[PDB]
Amino acid sequence: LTVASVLVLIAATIAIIALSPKCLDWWQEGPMYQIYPRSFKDSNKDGNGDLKGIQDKLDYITALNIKTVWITSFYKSSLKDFRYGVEDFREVDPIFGTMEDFENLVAAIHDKGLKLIIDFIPNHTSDKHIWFQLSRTRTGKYTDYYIWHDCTHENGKTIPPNNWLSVYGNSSWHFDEVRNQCYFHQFMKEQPDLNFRNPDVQEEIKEILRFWLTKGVDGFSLDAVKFLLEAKHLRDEIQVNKTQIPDTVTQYSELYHDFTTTQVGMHDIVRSFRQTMDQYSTEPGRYRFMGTEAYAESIDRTVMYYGLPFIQEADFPFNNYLSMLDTVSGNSVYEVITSWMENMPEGKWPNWMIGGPDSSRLTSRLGNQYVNVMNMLLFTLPGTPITYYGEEIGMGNIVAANLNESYDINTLRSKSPMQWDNSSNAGFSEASNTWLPTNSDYHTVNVDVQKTQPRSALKLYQDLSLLHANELLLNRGWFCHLRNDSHYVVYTRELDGIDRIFIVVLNFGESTLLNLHNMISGLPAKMRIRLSTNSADKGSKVDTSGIFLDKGEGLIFEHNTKNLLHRQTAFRDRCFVSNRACYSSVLNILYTSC
Amino acid sequence: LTVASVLVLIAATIAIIALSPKCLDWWQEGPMYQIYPRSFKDSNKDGNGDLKGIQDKLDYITALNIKTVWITSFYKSSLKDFRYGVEDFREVDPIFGTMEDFENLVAAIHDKGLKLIIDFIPNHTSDKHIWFQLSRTRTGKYTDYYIWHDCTHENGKTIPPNNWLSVYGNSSWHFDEVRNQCYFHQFMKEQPDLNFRNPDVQEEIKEILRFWLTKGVDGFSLDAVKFLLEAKHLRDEIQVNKTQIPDTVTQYSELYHDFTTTQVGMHDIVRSFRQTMDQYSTEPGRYRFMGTEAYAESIDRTVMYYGLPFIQEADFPFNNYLSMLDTVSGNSVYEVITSWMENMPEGKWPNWMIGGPDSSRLTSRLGNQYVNVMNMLLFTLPGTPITYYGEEIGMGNIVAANLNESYDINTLRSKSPMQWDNSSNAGFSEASNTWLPTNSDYHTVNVDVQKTQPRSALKLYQDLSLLHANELLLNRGWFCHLRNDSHYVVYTRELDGIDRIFIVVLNFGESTLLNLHNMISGLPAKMRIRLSTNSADKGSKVDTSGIFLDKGEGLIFEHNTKNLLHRQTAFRDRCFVSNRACYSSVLNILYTSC
Ligand SMILES: *[C@@H]1O[C@H](CO)[C@@H](O)[C@H](O)[C@H]1NC(C)=O
Ligand SMILES: *[C@@H]1O[C@H](CO)[C@@H](O)[C@H](O)[C@H]1NC(C)=O
Ligand SMILES: *[C@@H]1O[C@H](CO)[C@@H](O)[C@H](O)[C@H]1NC(C)=O
Ligand SMILES: *[C@@H]1O[C@H](CO)[C@@H](O)[C@H](O)[C@H]1NC(C)=O
Ligand SMILES: *[C@@H]1O[C@H](CO)[C@@H](O)[C@H](O)[C@H]1NC(C)=O
Ligand SMILES: *[C@@H]1O[C@H](CO)[C@@H](O)[C@H](O)[C@H]1NC(C)=O
Ligand SMILES: *[C@@H]1O[C@H](CO)[C@@H](O)[C@H](O)[C@H]1NC(C)=O
Ligand SMILES: *[C@@H]1O[C@H](CO)[C@@H](O)[C@H](O)[C@H]1NC(C)=O
Ligand SMILES: [Ca+2]
Ligand SMILES: [Ca+2]
């Protein structure tokens, strides 16, 4: 009998190994906390943030159950704004420390189990770059590193070869008196676009990627992908106003950009970036993440960066939606969620971010009442929640100050220093005359004040990430949304074998009442609030038929049943999942077939 | 001692297996002989060629050392010309036999060691197709199988949504009175373009590919790849003449086609076609070939179909060059060869074809004197030589006849029936009033006459394919061309370890004399002609300094030396190879490292 029982065990183990799904990578589980390196924490007492200040506050990052950091671009740049025109990719600016300060930051990050991500701008460079200074003199192989074209430039003004306009001004062809030819920049006067059609240039970007990968940056995040390649035929773009007179079109909005955005072969360059990073992802635990971050485009063009089922391009493109939305309601939020889940290919991992560097703050664009409900929506979605720095608490925008450095007046309100304490400059730096004035109402909004008091908008961010990390329904579960309303958004998170669902209700309306008996069938007489926007109500009792919800109010309901909505014939076109799996309570393991 | 000698043998075998390069596939070695199914051979005595007639003449195909057939598109088509508008992809027309006649043809081909290739047109369909007849009525899923757009069509004339013109006429948007909407065809009034943005349509093409792959067609050959996808924004194309008045542009030449050719995502559809055929290529000997056949475009766009080093797209695109060349000289032929070898990525397999269906005959475009020299150029190049039907001998064009069927007046001169015998209709068919009049001078030009007489332009095609198949220098060897001349084209074929080179000299001039001592160094006082255009110098003696060459004269010199040009520092930018390998005379095996 034992001789049969010994193989029945080996057959059981080989079945578990064959039925166990692939474990979620570090970029799939755990939220991200995007950090601005200049407005997070200062250590050397100079006025600007540094990489050492992020290492000192590393314990606070783990306190929020954060997995990845995604530090914003920190390079030796002559232009700190406008897509971060870099003049030296291998070196770091005098600010943010030195190369040794960066090596100690990534090492301390790996000791606490965290992951790092750095921004990468392969599209353009700076005017002070060693490649551009050698290109104007036609020195060696660098003579064709940029898009150069012969243009006429007489006594008074320059004439571009075409009407191609830059995103931040006029005349995206500028003339220089050294090379006597116009160069294509498309972003700014001091940001020449790096010609990617040169095989030498495409290989030079590989050396920059491998340089940081050996340091252990644990992935990249491309900035401008759709501006890589342009049309070889320097033809004029189609104007939006056909009757418009020429010599007047100077705005990037009044022009159809069909020859300077998303050209043939642009994705193949993105496909080659993943192939280079794949050489460093051979380790079982050391996987490399790659983000495209293509903003200001339609939904069908964003989902193209996910790749094809037979060729890998990128893990996921950064979800620009939910950030440009100024006025939120039941229909605007529902349209954004369905636009991403319906256009994304199946088996991919979505993502969501409420705010970012080039966007207004949450409480300044939506309001202080929507800070709690938007944080729950970020953690109750199947995608990877991405959080901006200072977004876990309610940090308002600041007025535009006149800085001597070349910085964008707009989109600078989000670069305010992090409010740590209630001391001078909100504890961001012990020095005076900081690079940006700290927000005025910092004595009432800071990490130290919100930690000591209950019912604050800091504990809600803590237990949401804890609920997202501990519970398996939020990590890898189905997403079944319930129709469309203008005063409430309700969706259900479920998984096979759990015998328990999560009902998330977000108001986004005007203090209306919800009847849960009209949306989901089979709910009992009473249901418990697992997580309330106002902590004073967690673990309370509310009946389904009639729920009092305020403006900025959101609830999470935990119901025990084996009546998952994803199994019913009605909820088949409104249920999405990335990794279909079945849970087993008896044998605590993940199953594919069930 | 023996205990050490036994492992020294195993170490030798495991070294040979590890150093042996990959064997050349069936599409890399052996020439192709493209056959027109309607003008090759008739069996049922009806007037038109059939697939059974190709089976009867299969022994002649093997007599030319031909590896692949590449039968031109033979489907149930309502339009036999203009890119072969098909109305039924799963069935065959009444002509060319039935489905059983095709199954007996592919089976007889595999018995003689030959390979088959069929043409595939996934771009468009016919008006009588079951998909188009079901699309005009909006019946089920077929309502979006074609590019439909709402257009105005009042009493007198239709108005297209844009100025997009077809390749064969005006107004590539036509109106139908059933669906009351304009459909996009881009080729002809009865050739609606199949909308590929529909996930259903892209999957329906997979079922057509798998249908023929189970029959054993041994690969496909796509017809129109650059016309698959179009721009979703129905914007007007840029006119070549800016001052041109609208309502007059009706020619495909006077318009820049930037929104209807080579769109973003077109290659991804081609990448998916190879992924479907890869499921049938798992066998070691049963490999599937895929050709793109993108004509009328630049060289940088044609080499993009070769694929990337990390994703396979196609084996090789069909080389449209060397066919549009009407007047041949030393510079026109040299530019074509260098344009393909310099733009093609390394490790790929090139190709060459002198003529085709949509091109004039060789002796009618170049002359009867250039028939012999162009056949040698096809077999002395590293690519896969592709030969049109009737091209091995000198077959002239015919005058344009008025046929009752919808056929193109031009490009029909190449569809003349094959001249087999000197009987009625040149032995093509025993019936009268054939579909196309056989060329008049068939009593002097036929396969039977050229076989019995020596010094004909049929034996030169036989021993060239024999020399290309037997000798390894022509199969997989280096290609080092010697500078540029206007009265002779000289290149050298060599391989490491052979200790012997092949010097090919083609005149393409006006009966000039060549001094071989000025081009290649190290040649002896006398050299032998392995293969000559005029089959009389085969084994003669000619000194290097001074060689008498006529207008249509070509020579192959076989020199024994270990001074290969590809090893010298001067001939490094003019030497190309696909599979770099080293030969060993002692051990008759192929080596990678040497
Ligand atoms: C165009 O050039 C002029 C001259 O500097 C400048 O004042 C103007 O701001 C430019 N247009 C835009 C939109 O920046
Ligand atoms: C822009 O379009 C409008 C037509 O609606 C008209 O003002 C004109 O065609 C254009 N404006 C100017 C100043 O030309
Ligand atoms: C800062 O916080 C501490 C404790 O919360 C408090 O005692 C102190 O009065 C505060 N100082 C200012 C300037 O707000
Ligand atoms: C739901 O969506 C449709 C179209 O988007 C809209 O017409 C309808 O008013 C919406 N229903 C509610 C309750 O908002
Ligand atoms: C345009 O339409 C007219 C009407 O049939 C036709 O005669 C003409 O041939 C068309 N143009 C071309 C280039 O075919
Ligand atoms: C085409 O271009 C030429 C200018 O070279 C001129 O004839 C005109 O602009 C165009 N022709 C017509 C008939 O409009
Ligand atoms: C055809 O060929 C045979 C042998 O070559 C010859 O005897 C006969 O006279 C020829 N007939 C015609 C009509 O050319
Ligand atoms: C070779 O090519 C160059 C440019 O294509 C041309 O100027 C030159 O005349 C050519 N030399 C000969 C002998 O044809
Ligand atoms: Ca660029
Ligand atoms: Ca099409």
Side-chain angles (χ1 to χ4, degrees):
Chain A
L1 172 147
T2 40
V3 76
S5 265
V6 282
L7 291 66
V8 88
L9 270 204
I10 312 310
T13 68
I14 199 173
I16 293 181
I17 306 203
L19 289 181
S20 267
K22 180 182 179 180
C23 164
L24 301 185
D25 290 324
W26 58 268
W27 58 270
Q28 305 192 29
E29 50 185 355
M32 302 182 179
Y33 181 67
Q34 185 178 7
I35 288 181
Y36 201 79
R38 205 179 180 178
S39 315
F40 191 72
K41 181 55 184 178
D42 181 31
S43 51
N44 46 19
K45 204 181 301 179
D46 55 355
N48 312 340
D50 48 66
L51 297 176
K52 179 58 183 179
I54 311 179
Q55 182 181 0
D56 293 348
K57 291 296 188 301
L58 216 61
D59 246 358
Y60 160 72
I61 307 178
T62 78
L64 303 178
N65 306 274
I66 293 299
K67 184 61 180 180
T68 326
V69 190
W70 183 22
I71 301 185
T72 302
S73 177
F74 53 108
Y75 298 97
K76 190 173 184 178
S77 321
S78 151
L79 190 63
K80 299 299 180 180
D81 213 81
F82 310 107
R83 299 312 185 98
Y84 305 96
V86 184
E87 84 189 14
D88 201 338
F89 295 94
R90 308 292 189 85
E91 221 66 40
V92 197
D93 53 327
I95 324 165
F96 314 134
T98 55
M99 276 293 303
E100 284 81 6
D101 291 1
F102 168 76
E103 293 179 347
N104 295 134
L105 173 61
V106 51
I109 279 181
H110 296 352
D111 299 348
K112 297 187 179 184
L114 310 185
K115 292 289 186 177
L116 191 55
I117 284 178
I118 65 173
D119 257 329
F120 189 50
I121 315 105
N123 178 30
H124 56 92
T125 60
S126 187
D127 266 357
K128 316 301 294 181
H129 203 104
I130 200 60
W131 296 345
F132 189 70
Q133 295 295 330
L134 264 62
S135 295
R136 304 156 68 181
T137 77
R138 299 182 177 91
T139 297
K141 65 175 65 178
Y142 306 96
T143 180
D144 38 29
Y145 262 46
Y146 298 83
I147 304 180
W148 291 97
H149 201 80
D150 311 88
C151 56
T152 165
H153 170 270
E154 77 294 338
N155 49 77
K157 186 200 306 186
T158 167
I159 286 91
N162 41 25
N163 68 337
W164 290 3
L165 303 174
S166 156
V167 198
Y168 298 105
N170 330 318
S171 164
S172 92
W173 295 90
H174 278 309
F175 180 87
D176 67 325
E177 313 78 271
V178 175
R179 213 176 197 266
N180 272 264
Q181 294 183 190
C182 284
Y183 66 96
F184 184 78
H185 62 91
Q186 204 190 195
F187 267 143
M188 267 296 188
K189 195 177 185 61
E190 315 91 5
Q191 281 178 327
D193 261 358
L194 204 59
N195 181 29
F196 253 89
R197 303 192 178 277
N198 199 339
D200 292 85
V201 170
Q202 195 173 2
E203 197 266 339
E204 274 279 351
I205 306 299
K206 315 299 182 178
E207 297 176 28
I208 305 180
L209 289 175
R210 299 189 192 98
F211 170 75
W212 294 101
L213 282 185
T214 56
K215 303 293 183 178
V217 303
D218 260 316
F220 286 94
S221 147
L222 311 180
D223 181 48
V225 277
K226 63 181 185 178
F227 298 109
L228 286 178
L229 285 183
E230 289 80 16
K232 295 203 303 296
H233 47 72
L234 266 62
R235 297 166 184 169
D236 296 3
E237 300 272 17
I238 299 182
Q239 302 179 0
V240 181
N241 208 334
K242 286 301 184 62
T243 329
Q244 190 172 0
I245 191 57
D247 307 46
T248 299
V249 188
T250 49
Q251 303 302 109
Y252 193 77
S253 81
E254 49 177 318
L255 204 64
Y256 287 141
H257 318 293
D258 304 329
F259 303 139
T260 58
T261 303
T262 321
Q263 295 305 118
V264 176
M266 183 267 297
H267 287 90
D268 291 328
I269 302 183
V270 187
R271 259 75 161 267
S272 58
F273 286 155
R274 171 61 75 178
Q275 194 71 209
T276 303
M277 302 179 63
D278 274 351
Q279 319 299 326
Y280 292 80
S281 322
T282 70
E283 312 186 39
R286 294 275 291 181
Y287 190 77
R288 259 59 183 180
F289 171 84
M290 210 200 73
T292 62
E293 197 173 62
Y295 290 177
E297 65 178 10
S298 58
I299 183 62
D300 53 307
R301 293 183 177 271
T302 308
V303 298
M304 287 184 59
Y305 297 97
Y306 272 109
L308 304 170
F310 45 86
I311 165 69
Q312 181 77 16
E313 173 174 351
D315 289 323
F316 55 83
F318 289 98
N319 200 330
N320 196 23
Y321 304 97
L322 275 187
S323 303
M324 300 295 107
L325 218 61
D326 313 79
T327 83
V328 289
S329 99
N331 301 124
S332 75
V333 177
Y334 173 75
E335 213 288 335
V336 165
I337 300 181
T338 44
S339 178
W340 193 271
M341 298 309 296
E342 288 178 351
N343 294 268
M344 176 187 59
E346 325 265 348
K348 300 300 180 180
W349 199 262
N351 75 101
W352 274 280
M353 45 195 304
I354 311 302
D358 313 308
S359 164
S360 180
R361 284 290 182 175
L362 179 57
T363 176
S364 312
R365 188 181 67 254
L366 267 57
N368 64 320
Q369 308 182 38
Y370 286 101
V371 178
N372 298 270
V373 63
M374 289 300 292
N375 283 330
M376 166 158 290
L377 174 61
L378 197 60
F379 280 92
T380 48
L381 281 169
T384 296
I386 304 177
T387 300
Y388 195 48
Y389 91 97
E391 188 195 328
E392 60 271 61
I393 61 180
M395 281 188 54
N397 274 329
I398 64 179
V399 307
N402 308 6
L403 277 77
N404 44 42
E405 317 187 55
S406 182
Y407 254 95
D408 199 327
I409 296 313
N410 303 285
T411 70
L412 196 62
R413 46 196 177 181
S414 319
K415 315 298 177 58
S416 36
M418 183 58 177
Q419 305 168 173
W420 294 106
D421 303 347
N422 66 331
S423 98
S424 60
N425 315 282
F428 163 76
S429 82
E430 310 148 290
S432 155
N433 51 69
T434 90
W435 91 281
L436 213 57
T438 298
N439 193 270
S440 324
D441 45 88
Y442 68 92
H443 312 86
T444 80
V445 185
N446 54 90
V447 189
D448 276 38
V449 158
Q450 296 235 5
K451 265 167 56 181
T452 60
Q453 60 184 197
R455 277 178 52 250
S456 73
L458 185 52
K459 305 297 201 308
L460 185 58
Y461 187 85
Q462 288 182 341
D463 48 27
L464 259 162
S465 295
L466 265 176
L467 184 66
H468 182 269
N470 291 128
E471 273 289 336
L472 205 61
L473 291 167
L474 300 183
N475 272 318
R476 36 192 308 174
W478 287 78
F479 176 76
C480 298
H481 59 253
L482 293 121
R483 5 120 356 180
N484 66 324
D485 198 88
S486 100
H487 285 89
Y488 47 84
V489 173
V490 189
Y491 46 90
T492 303
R493 291 280 274 160
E494 34 185 71
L495 185 63
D496 283 322
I498 299 286
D499 281 276
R500 172 168 49 95
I501 67 178
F502 267 127
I503 302 177
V504 184
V505 169
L506 313 177
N507 192 40
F508 293 138
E510 271 304 309
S511 166
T512 78
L513 181 130
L514 171 64
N515 195 333
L516 265 185
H517 263 164
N518 286 171
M519 309 201 69
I520 320 162
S521 201
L523 301 175
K526 288 299 187 62
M527 302 188 68
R528 324 190 71 270
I529 311 179
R530 167 105 213 219
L531 204 30
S532 178
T533 29
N534 180 14
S535 295
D537 267 319
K538 183 169 71 172
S540 279
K541 276 297 191 300
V542 175
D543 61 356
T544 71
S545 68
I547 304 182
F548 264 85
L549 300 175
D550 197 8
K551 182 178 181 180
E553 228 286 339
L555 306 179
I556 278 190
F557 285 107
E558 192 197 84
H559 182 32
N560 318 96
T561 168
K562 62 180 68 180
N563 223 286
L564 317 181
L565 271 72
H566 86 92
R567 292 180 172 270
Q568 307 180 197
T569 167
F571 308 92
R572 281 198 172 187
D573 43 318
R574 296 176 299 184
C575 291
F576 315 99
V577 70
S578 282
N579 295 120
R580 184 177 306 176
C582 178
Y583 193 78
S584 279
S585 35
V586 42
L587 272 163
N588 265 359
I589 43 90
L590 286 176
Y591 264 158
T592 36
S593 268
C594 207
Chain B
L1 172 147
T2 40
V3 76
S5 265
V6 282
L7 291 66
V8 88
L9 270 204
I10 312 310
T13 69
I14 199 173
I16 293 181
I17 306 203
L19 289 181
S20 267
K22 180 181 179 180
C23 164
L24 301 185
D25 290 324
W26 57 268
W27 58 270
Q28 305 192 29
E29 50 185 355
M32 302 182 179
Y33 181 67
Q34 185 178 7
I35 288 180
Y36 201 79
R38 205 179 180 178
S39 315
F40 191 72
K41 181 55 184 178
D42 181 31
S43 51
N44 46 19
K45 204 181 301 179
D46 55 355
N48 312 340
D50 48 66
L51 297 176
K52 180 58 182 179
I54 311 179
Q55 182 181 0
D56 293 348
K57 290 296 188 301
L58 216 61
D59 184 1
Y60 160 72
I61 307 178
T62 78
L64 303 178
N65 306 274
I66 293 299
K67 185 61 180 180
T68 326
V69 190
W70 183 22
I71 301 185
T72 302
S73 177
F74 53 108
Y75 298 97
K76 190 173 184 177
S77 321
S78 151
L79 190 63
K80 299 299 180 180
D81 213 81
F82 310 107
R83 299 312 185 98
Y84 305 96
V86 184
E87 84 189 14
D88 201 338
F89 294 94
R90 308 292 189 85
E91 221 66 40
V92 197
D93 53 327
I95 324 165
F96 314 134
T98 55
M99 276 294 303
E100 284 81 5
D101 291 1
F102 168 76
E103 293 179 347
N104 295 134
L105 173 61
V106 51
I109 278 181
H110 296 352
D111 299 348
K112 297 187 179 184
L114 310 185
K115 292 288 186 177
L116 191 55
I117 284 178
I118 65 173
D119 257 328
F120 189 50
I121 315 104
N123 178 29
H124 56 92
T125 60
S126 187
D127 266 357
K128 316 300 295 181
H129 203 104
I130 200 60
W131 296 346
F132 189 70
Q133 295 295 330
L134 264 61
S135 178
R136 304 156 68 181
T137 77
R138 299 182 177 91
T139 297
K141 65 175 65 178
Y142 306 96
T143 180
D144 38 29
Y145 262 46
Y146 298 83
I147 304 180
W148 291 97
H149 201 80
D150 312 88
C151 56
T152 165
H153 170 270
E154 76 294 338
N155 49 77
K157 186 200 306 186
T158 167
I159 286 91
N162 41 25
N163 68 337
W164 290 3
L165 303 174
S166 156
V167 198
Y168 298 104
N170 330 318
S171 164
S172 92
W173 295 90
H174 278 309
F175 180 87
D176 67 325
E177 313 78 271
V178 175
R179 213 176 197 266
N180 272 264
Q181 294 183 190
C182 284
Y183 66 95
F184 184 78
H185 62 91
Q186 204 190 196
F187 267 143
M188 267 296 188
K189 195 176 185 61
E190 315 92 5
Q191 281 178 327
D193 261 358
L194 204 59
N195 181 29
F196 253 89
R197 303 192 178 277
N198 199 339
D200 275 313
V201 170
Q202 195 173 2
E203 197 266 339
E204 274 279 351
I205 306 299
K206 315 298 182 178
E207 297 176 28
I208 305 180
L209 289 175
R210 299 188 191 98
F211 170 75
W212 294 101
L213 282 185
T214 56
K215 303 293 183 178
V217 303
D218 260 316
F220 286 95
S221 147
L222 311 180
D223 181 48
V225 277
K226 62 181 186 178
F227 298 109
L228 287 178
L229 285 183
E230 289 80 16
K232 295 203 303 296
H233 47 72
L234 266 62
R235 297 166 184 169
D236 296 3
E237 300 272 17
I238 299 182
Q239 302 179 0
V240 181
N241 207 334
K242 286 301 184 62
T243 329
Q244 190 172 0
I245 191 57
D247 307 46
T248 299
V249 188
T250 49
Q251 303 302 109
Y252 193 77
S253 81
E254 49 177 319
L255 204 64
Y256 287 141
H257 317 293
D258 304 328
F259 303 139
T260 58
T261 303
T262 321
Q263 295 305 118
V264 176
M266 184 267 297
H267 287 90
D268 291 328
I269 302 184
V270 187
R271 259 75 161 267
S272 58
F273 286 155
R274 171 61 75 178
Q275 194 71 209
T276 303
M277 302 179 63
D278 274 351
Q279 319 299 326
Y280 292 80
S281 322
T282 70
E283 312 186 38
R286 294 275 291 181
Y287 190 77
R288 260 59 183 180
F289 171 84
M290 210 200 74
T292 62
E293 197 173 62
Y295 290 177
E297 65 178 11
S298 58
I299 183 62
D300 52 307
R301 293 183 177 271
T302 308
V303 298
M304 287 184 59
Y305 296 97
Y306 272 109
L308 304 170
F310 45 86
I311 165 68
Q312 181 76 16
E313 173 174 351
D315 289 323
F316 55 83
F318 289 98
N319 200 330
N320 196 23
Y321 304 97
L322 275 187
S323 303
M324 300 295 107
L325 218 61
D326 313 79
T327 83
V328 289
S329 99
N331 301 124
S332 75
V333 177
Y334 173 75
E335 213 288 335
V336 165
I337 300 181
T338 44
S339 178
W340 193 271
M341 298 309 296
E342 288 178 351
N343 294 268
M344 176 187 59
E346 325 265 348
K348 300 300 180 180
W349 199 262
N351 75 101
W352 274 280
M353 45 195 304
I354 311 302
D358 313 308
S359 164
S360 180
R361 284 290 182 175
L362 179 57
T363 176
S364 312
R365 188 181 68 254
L366 267 57
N368 64 320
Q369 308 182 38
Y370 286 101
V371 178
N372 298 270
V373 63
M374 289 300 293
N375 283 330
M376 166 158 290
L377 174 61
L378 197 60
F379 280 92
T380 48
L381 281 169
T384 296
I386 304 177
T387 300
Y388 195 48
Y389 91 97
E391 188 195 328
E392 60 270 61
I393 61 179
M395 281 188 54
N397 274 329
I398 64 179
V399 307
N402 308 6
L403 277 77
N404 44 42
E405 317 187 55
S406 182
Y407 254 95
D408 199 327
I409 296 313
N410 303 285
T411 70
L412 195 61
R413 46 196 177 181
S414 319
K415 315 299 177 58
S416 36
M418 183 58 177
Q419 305 168 173
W420 294 106
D421 303 347
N422 66 330
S423 98
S424 60
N425 315 282
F428 163 76
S429 82
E430 310 148 290
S432 155
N433 51 68
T434 90
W435 91 281
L436 213 57
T438 298
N439 193 271
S440 323
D441 45 88
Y442 68 92
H443 312 86
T444 80
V445 185
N446 54 90
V447 189
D448 276 38
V449 158
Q450 296 235 5
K451 265 167 56 181
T452 60
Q453 61 184 197
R455 277 178 51 250
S456 73
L458 185 52
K459 305 297 201 308
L460 185 58
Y461 187 85
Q462 288 182 341
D463 48 27
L464 259 162
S465 64
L466 264 176
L467 184 66
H468 182 269
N470 291 128
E471 273 289 336
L472 205 61
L473 291 167
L474 300 183
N475 272 318
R476 36 192 308 174
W478 287 78
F479 176 76
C480 298
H481 57 260
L482 277 304
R483 6 117 358 180
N484 69 326
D485 198 88
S486 100
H487 285 89
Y488 47 84
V489 173
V490 189
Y491 47 90
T492 303
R493 291 280 274 160
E494 34 185 71
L495 185 63
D496 283 322
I498 299 286
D499 281 276
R500 172 168 49 95
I501 67 177
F502 266 127
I503 303 177
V504 184
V505 170
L506 313 177
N507 192 39
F508 293 138
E510 271 304 309
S511 166
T512 78
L513 181 130
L514 171 64
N515 195 333
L516 265 185
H517 263 164
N518 286 171
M519 309 201 69
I520 320 162
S521 201
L523 301 175
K526 288 299 188 62
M527 302 188 68
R528 301 183 60 183
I529 306 87
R530 177 64 180 86
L531 233 95
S532 52
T533 42
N534 192 31
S535 165
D537 352 341
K538 309 250 213 256
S540 279
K541 276 297 191 300
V542 175
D543 61 356
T544 71
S545 68
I547 304 181
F548 264 85
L549 300 175
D550 197 8
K551 182 178 181 180
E553 228 286 339
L555 306 179
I556 278 190
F557 285 107
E558 192 197 84
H559 182 32
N560 318 96
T561 168
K562 62 180 68 180
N563 223 286
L564 317 181
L565 271 72
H566 86 92
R567 292 180 172 270
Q568 307 180 197
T569 167
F571 308 92
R572 281 198 173 187
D573 43 318
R574 296 176 299 184
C575 291
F576 315 99
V577 70
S578 282
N579 295 120
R580 184 177 306 176
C582 178
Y583 193 78
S584 279
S585 35
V586 42
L587 272 163
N588 265 359
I589 43 90
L590 286 176
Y591 264 158
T592 36
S593 268
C594 207

